[model samples]
Target: GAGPEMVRGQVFDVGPRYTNLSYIGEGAYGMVCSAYDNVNKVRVAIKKISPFEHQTYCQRTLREIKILLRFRHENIIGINDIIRAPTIEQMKDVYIVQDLMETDLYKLLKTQHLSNDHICYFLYQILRGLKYIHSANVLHRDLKPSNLLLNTTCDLKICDFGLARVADPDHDHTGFLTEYVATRWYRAPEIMLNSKGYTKSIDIWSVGCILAEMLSNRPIFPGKHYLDQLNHILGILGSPSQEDLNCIINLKARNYLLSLPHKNKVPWNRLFPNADSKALDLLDKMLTFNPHKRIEVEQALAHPYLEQYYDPSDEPIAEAPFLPKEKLKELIFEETARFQPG
Candidate 1:
């Protein structure tokens, strides 16, 4: 292989069956790499995530695995296989295998020149995936470009669903603490309200960011801090109307916005001078300051921008909600039962 200083790529203890490992993508939660599948004679994505450092992290990781296993959609990433040590002490990290992609949207955006059709198709897939996820009451708190996987064929699949539950009050609170560690950029305004809680429209705001980023090749609101993040939007979208401000349940957060120097709403055309008019129209709806006003994923799919690609038959919804912590727990236990020291 060459000198130690010049190694090819680091390999995780995934399994002896996987080789030719090369790091590809990463997020706040874990590392992902490409590996050769000796058994399947193809390449795959291996995600090495630690679920034991924090107790709740295990629950969240299990939630991700369960969703990946249950939800079958062309635009949603599915599990190909998994290897987690059953021995409790050694089961700190888990290795997951899934069909590999050429790259993620983040990396692809760096090099590719996407046409309007490319943007249309890609946006359609993301919304389609979101529609299904929201159908199951799962909010993909993380929907940045890095989480959107793609191949040379121009196919996109959503990945890394976190803090999901259909209607578990106990687990619902975990979302605030669990998922929003570093990705404040795509977070919705309601989320910034803190402890006020939020709805599935949070994902809509995120997709709005992703769409803008794709169009400009730069994050529209790349704020360094959470306050600045809100400021970034206010600066562009301008101050919210009285009705929009009333949506903030937190008094202090509401006043903070009121106190800010007023800014006029900048027209979308000015922000995206060269973007297609229809795309801009949709973007206008997606990036609304009020979460309630944000276009629902279902409505976004049916928007004129996605009219060419919208086919209700092809866009599927989850038959069952991703719910009931007991089910997720049992699913994790089942995974542990099958674990053979990787």
Candidate 2:
């Protein structure tokens, strides 16, 4: 209890800088906890990432670290530090330090009573953060309530870069970061259907689902399968026009949709009768069946719902879209160099 064998009966090998470790929970990435920073005089979140058992986890670890370093926004989560192993042989687990959040948005939604200003405060920051992310030509392909870190003081930060993609690349390979990459409930139709190389608008669809859940406390399109996800979208947004269907890439996907009975778009007010008119209006613009027609980040930031807190000048953009020079080994070596003793 007093030495390296303090945490987990092995060794609290995350370095001497952090102590008072309390395990939070685990994700596909690995286990996370809140720890006290001895020098900083504050608490921080520490993630003990599981070994690079596969290529996907290793790829995402580098990508997330790079993006966190390149970005400087209060709304987007930042890495305070990345604890390194003494040797690659000892690198079975990677420890990373990040902003300490009390709870995630999804956890809060299940219990807390969210008021109007609460939704605005949360949504505004989300859009503001996305404004900066999209400005750099990056796509946060996986965005949902759980990915949003929250604090009791009303702060929300967007986190997790598990499947973030650089949009303008010659080849848009996900590097096998698929199958379980994105969540169906908040995924954009274009992405679910593989309609095209989906754009930043895919994130817009997620924010729409997020805001919808903020009001209703339920997933907007909680589907069980890819085909069923399309069905959920059609049920709520109504069937896409035949001309709109032309954009779908697969012949069978379009055919399957056409075979299903058509439905009318549900009135947002009915779905959220107790919600503000401005909010319902924004949802309409956001949940559009057509990605091209979906609201842009900048426009969403300026919407009437966020009018109370809309400050265009306050929103910032990333200096550059990261990891674009684009080579897995190049990035790997670059990251290794940063951790090396010069």
Candidate 3:
């Protein structure tokens, strides 16, 4: 009785600094818990990341940590501290401390009807976070409603950057980036087409999907697989232009898209009969077929739909950080070495 007790199916003690209170949820990489920070006297989310035995897990965790450490925007989730095992031999798990929010956007949209103000506010915050991230040359490849944390005041904070990558527009190579990176529903057209060199426009497409879902209470494109996902876009948006088609470097992808039955493009007015025209216009620009033609984060924030909330200071002032492929691999290796047996 003097020792740890069961609390929400988990033991009360995790480490000296954290008191495990309850299990929050599980995701692709780690188990999350609501833990009490003894030092700060506050409740915070502690993500117990599994041991990095594999290279992929190590690289992913390192990327997430690096991105979180540098970003300090109000609309982005901030890391408080990291608890690690004492010795290299005992290094099996790492606990990440983060700000606690009421719920994520996914659950919020599921249970409540977001008014136009709520949508505008939340979208503005998301754009702010993206603006800061893209300013750092980092792409939040996985941006779904679930990854957007929220509190009682409808304040949104972008989270989960396991799939984020440092992209350079002048560069031609894609190192850690992959076609199967983001969640299927929120993935952009360029990713679905298996495009080789993509840019920050991919994240804008995801925000567009999230905005549409907030309006309709359902995913705009709920495809089962990659092929079905492409079909879903084609069904609604029709075929891409020949100029856009030529931009696809993957011959197989181009051939498959060409072979599909062509249909007339659907107008944004028909897609969202009740949405504001400005909102539809912004969405159309974001969901463009070609990544090059798609709207940028800065442009999206300044769109007429969000004109009421636009602020010039909302954009980051610094140039985006660039990480070459070699440097990226070196950082990953250095991170892994921090946990290796001495």
Candidate 4:
């Protein structure tokens, strides 16, 4: 109420219950603003979605709620509450109450430009979160550095459940679909293949992509088009096996290469010139083209890279602006585990 037309800030006092602050994030979906909760004496991040984007976002919010309801772990991001803010028209403002994460994995590692040990530490935490998520029969369909939240101490919190899915035990495939979700390079082989369906393995595939990014200091897959994605992989990781081709048949880009088959050994040494042998070894397995063959989170966590980087015993520093894990689990999973799995 006190600036030019282009200027913006919290207009209404809404009082100490909330303090409007800066816009910290943005995307095709909506924008995220930082707010302070006087009652709790803590900073919280509030995501505001336009009514038009609400439908797509609602499902993701619900899916996140479902996943959070069942899996209570130290690495996963916690949702504090979901409530309706002051509504102007018939449409009400939907606010996802979450931990006020200090930063995201993207900024921490890349945007923040981290050191090797810091990168290793964050990667370990991501793997730990993935381990728990996979065991719960859930696949984080969309995984990228931005989706990972960084806590105050630089601890990791796997945030964003919109593109996530709960693994179905009975389905022939491990996960469900709605292909439009995944961030380009992080997509797994099965997804790239356009197979009948996918599974938790998809998330593992993303881990492989991300790990490579961590190693190379750039995105592993920057395909301009579908084939570009295929060619990028083929060029760096080599051609796919018959099975790899079978699962991803619908891809138009790689199809042209049917006759000109090529075989190239992965550019391993160039990617990790100084990494420990075990770390590189694990990366090789995780990045494999065969969806069935990719290393599982269980094995990935056991990799040597994490030997001294993470301590699973320490209480996870949750980034969402909410009660500590003790209260969160109670509010989210009281009947499921530790009160509730928020």
TM-score winner among the candidates? Answer: 2
Which candidate's lDDT is highest?
2
Per-residue lDDT of candidate 3, residues 45-102 (tens digit): 8777763566677667878877787778888998887766554456566667888887
TM-score of 1: 0.85
> Candidate 4, residues 1-342: lDDT per residue as tens digits?
322111144332223355656567664355676777767888887665433233454455445666765556667876565444332233333445567887776775565555667767777888888877766566778888888887788877787776766665245342223344567777665554444224767777778787777766688888776445656777778766676667643446246446546877666877678665666787788888776777877677667877775455552322331124333333222222332213
Location of the lowest summed lDDT over 10 successive residues in candidate 3: 170-179
CA lDDT, candidate 3, residue 207: 93
Q: Rank the candidates by lDDT, best first.
A: 2, 3, 1, 4
| lDDT score, candidate 4, position 118 | 75
Ranking by TM-score: 2, 3, 1, 4
Q: What lDDT score is found at residue 320 in candidate 2?
A: 77
Show where candidate 3 strays beyond 4 Å: 1-15, 169-179, 317-320, 323-342
All candidates' lDDT scores?
Answer: 0.76, 0.78, 0.77, 0.62
Judging by lDDT, tell me the better candidate of 1 and 4. Answer: 1
- Steric collisions counted per model: 0, 0, 0, 16
Candidate 1 accuracy as lDDT: 0.76
- Clash pairs, candidate 1, are none
Off by over 4 Å in 2: 5-10, 169-180, 323-342
Per-residue C-alpha lDDT of model 2 across residues 241-342, encoded as one tens digit per residue: 987788654665567667878798888898899999999999889998877788999999889899989988788887776523235434544564464445
> On a 0 to 100 scale, what is the lDDT of residue 3 in model 4?
29
